[PDB]
Amino acid sequence: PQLPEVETIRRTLLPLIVGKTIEDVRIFWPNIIRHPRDSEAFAARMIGQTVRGLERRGKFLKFLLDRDALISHLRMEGRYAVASALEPLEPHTHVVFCFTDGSELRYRDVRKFGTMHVYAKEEADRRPPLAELGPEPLSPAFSPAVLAERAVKTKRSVKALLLDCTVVAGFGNIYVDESLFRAGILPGRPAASLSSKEIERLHEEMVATIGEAVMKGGSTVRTYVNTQGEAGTFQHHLYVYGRQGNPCKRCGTPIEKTVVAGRGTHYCPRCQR
DNA sequence: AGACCCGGACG
DNA sequence: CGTCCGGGTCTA
Ligand SMILES: [Zn+2]
């Protein structure tokens, strides 16, 4: 899940939990719990708190409780659902928050990569994992100037640059490849090689792509669904991601796939330079 | 780049 | 049944 997927989950999850009070927290894979590292303290502190809000920062969900914020990262496969305490759990359910009304917030994660950190609200933004995060791409804090400043300082690939959460928040493998295609820039280009015009174009396409994907409920390419289990539709608007061997939608040249920055990387060798 | 982790898709 | 694949990304 990237920004659009996490944002769609945020919007669809909030009404199902807002105003509910935690009665128990049950943990079946303690490694997911990162702070307090003692899962017993993590569970104990949340009991009796009420969910007041749910925000997103980058790819993180921020559950606003009473004293605390719970910072949750889904990583590759994490997901939330709300269901009755009376029903058996689904496979791969690793954390459950039980509410006083008999419903439960269930966290499922087949690969177990997800993380949870709880801090006092006023502390969460200055501690890991939120502390190092770059600007929200849909905010004024993300500008061509901000992008140029990081690009000029490094010979790392432009793909690696956009995947760096400290540069800009919320971009992952799908939206980096898509933004680079739309901007006409090869993903293996050294970041420092980008012209002023290319930086401007890249910023414009990054903002447009993310916004469009939010509007379309995210990209369901393998396993992502919203809180109601509904697939996104942005996958129908992809130019390159997962389209290797298929014709480019713009020029008909077969899309190629390589490895860049240790990641599967999709591009059109004609449209991108 | 490796680790954390698992199951699907493909030969 | 084995091999490679994956919307993330921390540390090594
Ligand atoms: Zn093309």
Six-digit token string for A63: 């559950």
Amino acid (one-letter) located at A177? D
Whether A64 and A100 share a structural domain: yes
Whether A7 and A100 share a structural domain: yes
Closest residue by Cα to residue A83 from A242, A244, A227 = A227
* Buried/exposed A51-64: b ≥16 CB within 10 Å, e otherwise: beebebbbbbbbbb
Is the separation of the CB atoms in A187 and A273 below 8 Å?
no
Boundary residue ending a domain (A132, A161, A181): A132
Counted domains in chain A: 2
List, in order, residues 6 or more apart from A143 with CB less than 8 Å away: A203
Whether A215 and A237 share a structural domain: yes
Using the structure block, give the residue that is written with the tokens 């992008």.
A147
**For position A127, which CATH number holds?**
3.20.190.10
- The integer distance in angstroms from the CA atom of A113 to the C1' atom of B6 is 10
**For position A262, which CATH number holds?**
1.10.8.50
Whether A116 and A147 share a structural domain: no
Experimental method: X-ray
Q: How far apart are CA A139 and CA A44, in angstroms?
A: 36
- A75: Cβ under 7 Å from strand C? yes
Is the separation of the CB atoms in A224 and A7 below 8 Å?
no
- The integer distance in angstroms from the CA atom of A118 to the C1' atom of B4 is 21
Residues in chain A, total: 273
Question: Ligand 1: distance of its center to the CA of A59 in Å?
Answer: 30
| CA atoms within 13 Å, Cβ hemisphere of A90 | 13
- Please give, one letter per residue, the 3-state secondary structure of chain A: CCHHHHHHHHHHHHHHHCCCEEEEEEECCHHHEEECCCHHHHHHHHCCCECCEEEEECCEEEEECCCEEEEEECCCCCEEEEEECCCCCCCCEEEEEEECCCEEEEEECCCCCCEEEEEEHHHHCCCCCCCCCCCCCCCCCCCHHHHHHHHCCCCCEHHHHHHCCCCCCCCCHHHHHHHHHHHCCCCCCEHHHCCHHHHHHHHHHHHHHHHHHHHCCCCCCCCCCCCCCCCCCHHHHCCCCCCCCCECCCCCCECEEEEECCEEEEECCCCCC
Whether A2 and A123 share a structural domain: yes
Whether A27 and A76 share a structural domain: yes
Whether A240 and A142 share a structural domain: yes
- A218: Cβ under 7 Å from strand C? yes
Boundary residue ending a domain (A84, A117, A132): A132
Is the separation of the CB atoms in A114 and A73 below 8 Å?
yes
Whether A100 and A137 share a structural domain: no
Instruction: Give the nearest nucleotide to A59, CA to C1'.
Output: C8
Boundary residue ending a domain (A99, A132, A165): A132
Resolution (A): 1.7
Six-digit token string for A157: 């690939």
Q: Residue A261 — left, alpha, or beta (φ > 0 → left; ψ -120 to 50 → alpha)?
A: left
Which residue segment(s) compose the domain that A24 sits in?
Answer: 1-132
Six-digit token string for A151: 């690009």
Whether A127 and A156 share a structural domain: no
Q: How far apart are CA A75 and CA A96, in angstroms?
A: 18
Angle made by CA atoms A77, A83, A84, in degrees to the nearest 5:
145
Residues with CB under 7 A from strand B: A 29, 31, 91-92, 110-113, 262
Q: How far is CA A226 from CA A14, A49, A128, A143, A213, in A?
A: 12, 25, 26, 29, 13
